[PDB]
Each structure stands twice: as C-alpha cells, then as structure tokens.
C-alpha cells in the first residue's frame, strides 16, 4: 500500500536521451534535442539555462519547443538564419 | 573507510559518556595529536577515565570529539553476512591537527600528568599544547 524503508530515489536502467539538432543547420519546427517529455514555449532558438549561458541558431521556422526543464527550457525570443 | 552514520540497525551503547567539567565557561586550551587515526569509544573511555581519575584536584576537563562512525564485522563463513555490530562499535575520526581533550586551566598544569597517562592509552603519538 504505502512506501517504507527510509530510502531516497528509485533506480532502473540507463537514460534514453540524445543530442539531436545541434542547431547551426536547417531544422523543421520540432523537438530539438531529447531528454524528458512534455514541454512547450520556445518557438525558435532559445538555449538558455543557468550557467555560462547557451545558444542555437539559423533556421526560419514557426515554433519549435524544447524537451523540458533541461537544456534551456526557458523560452527566449525568436531567431532565424540571418536572412531567410 | 567511508564515513557511515545513520539509517542503520541499533548496535551497542556508548562506553563513553561523562563529559565532565563545568559547562559555564568556554575555553580554548587543548591536547593535540599529530596524525590521523580512528579511535573506538572503548578506547576513548580508558583515556578519558585515566585523566579524570587523576585530575581530582579540580575539573573543567572536556572532550570535543565523539564516536560517530559505525564499523561492523562478519564473524561466520563469508558469502552471507555483510557485517554485524560487535566489539567494533562507534569510532571517532581524528585529524592530523585536532584537539581532543582540552581542560579549562591557566598555568597550574596538574593535568599534564593526567594527559600523559591517557597519551599512553590511545594509539597515536600526541603532544601537549598550552595554546
């Protein structure tokens, strides 16, 4: 029923995440990168996470959220190639 | 030996206990030991009881380090049995420059004779410090 044995986190296997979409090349508005699911907001390049900063770039495409609270889950403001 | 602490089985009791001395005035004297070493509560008692049984002239004798690290043993076959709590009870961690016993006393040292008796009970060459 409950949970016992004063223990912390619960484990299993190896993570199933990747680094798809380095971004500096074309990219249709879709989930750039993969780690955890369910998240929206970013509609372009919005790599911004606590640290030395983050980035992405060039690619004119309406929308394009991130994975979730990970590699810059925050939603910055627009960005395209330079001249789409 | 990774520092073990809580979330474990209940073992034995402290062979130690009597903090001794009056806790009305805090001082900064001491008896430092040059070198890191693990001392079990069973040893701390012998050394502590040695000086206390000598400093009958007064008091103000206090200890700062307490035994908090658990150490188990597995007296049996092998495959089965991680480690139970036997003679090897709580053990304290002493740093190369840590003060174990400090008695609140000004140059009237009648405890140097006491600390000497204890210095011969704990494994590690200790030195008497005035500061």
């Amino acid at each position: 029923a409950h949970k016992k044995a004063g223990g912390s986190t619960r484990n299993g296997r190896d993570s199933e995440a990747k680094r798809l979409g380095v971004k500096r090349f074309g990219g249709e508005s879709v989930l750039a990168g993969s780690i955890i699911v369910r998240q929206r907001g970013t509609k372009f390049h919005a790599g911004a996470n606590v640290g030395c900063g983050r980035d992405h770039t060039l690619f004119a495409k309406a929308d394009g959220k991130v994975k979730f609270e990970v590699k810059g889950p925050k939603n910055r403001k627009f960005i395209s190639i330079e001249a789409e | 030996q990774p520092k073990r602490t809580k979330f474990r089985k209940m073992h034995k009791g402290r062979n130690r206990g009597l903090a001794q001395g009056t806790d009305v005035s805090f001082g900064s004297f001491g008896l430092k030991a040059v070198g890191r070493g693990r001392l079990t509560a069973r040893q701390i008692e012998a050394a502590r009881r040695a000086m206390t049984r000598a400093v009958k002239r007064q008091g103000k004798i206090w200890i700062r380090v307490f035994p908090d690290k658990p150490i188990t043993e597995k007296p049996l076959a092998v495959r089965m049995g991680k480690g139970k709590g036997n003679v090897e009870y709580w053990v304290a961690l002493i740093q190369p420059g840590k003060v174990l016993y400090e008695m609140d006393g000004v140059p009237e040292e009648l405890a140097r004779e006491a600390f000497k008796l204890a210095a011969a009970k704990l494994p590690i060459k200790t030195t008497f410090v005035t500061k």
Partner: protein, 113 residues
C-alpha cells in the same frame, strides 16, 4: 520555469507575445472607463482616450455606463488608426461577459481595428 507573479494572476498573456503585436487594455473605474493601445516591452502607450475626455466633444450623461464604454472605444480606435496601427488583441484582465469591455471591443472594430 516557475510561474511569475503576473502569471499567477493571469492578468498577462504570453500567447499574444509570441506573435509580436499590440494589446487593447480596458480599465474600468466606478466613475470612468479607460482604454489603451500598449505595445510590448514595458508600458508603451501609443494612443488612449478617457470617458471624461468624451465630454470635450459633447457628453452630457454619466460616464459609467455601457453607451459611454462604446463611445470611448470609437475614440481610442479613431486615434489609433491615425497613429498607424491596424490589428490589436483584446486584453480585459478580470471581468465578465457582455459587460462594458465587450462594448469597448465592439467599438474598436467599428472604427477600423
């Protein structure tokens, strides 16, 4: 990310900011009704008109009714079209339906917004 204080009061709208346009705030006081065409990045007011200013034209009755709410909408919008704005979204933070805010919006469209 966490929900900002403004998001907790849901008075703001992030979905209208993803487009990059302007808003049409409708403030209402038990005495007067205000309307503005503010643009993102702070409180940038391009054009605005108060029901009290409607008196400058020739308003006689009270300024806290529905017919007055529609009069202000036509004024704020008329000045907006004179500014250079065409489209705008309705932003009525906290209010009911068919109220004075709807009369303000219906008035804005009547002008050309």
């Amino acid at each position: 990310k966490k929900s900002a204080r403004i998001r907790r009061a849901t008075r703001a709208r992030r979905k209208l900011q993803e487009l990059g346009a302007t808003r049409l705030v409708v403030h209402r006081t038990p005495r007067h009704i205000y309307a503005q065409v503010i643009a993102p990045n702070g409180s940038e007011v391009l054009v605005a008109a108060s029901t009290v200013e409607k008196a400058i034209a020739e308003q006689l009755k009270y300024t806290g009714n529905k017919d007055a709410a529609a009069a202000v909408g036509k004024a704020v919008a008329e000045r907006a079209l004179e500014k250079g704005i065409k489209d705008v979204s309705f932003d009525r933070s906290g209010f009911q339906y068919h109220g004075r805010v709807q009369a303000l919006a219906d008035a804005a469209r009547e002008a050309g917004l």
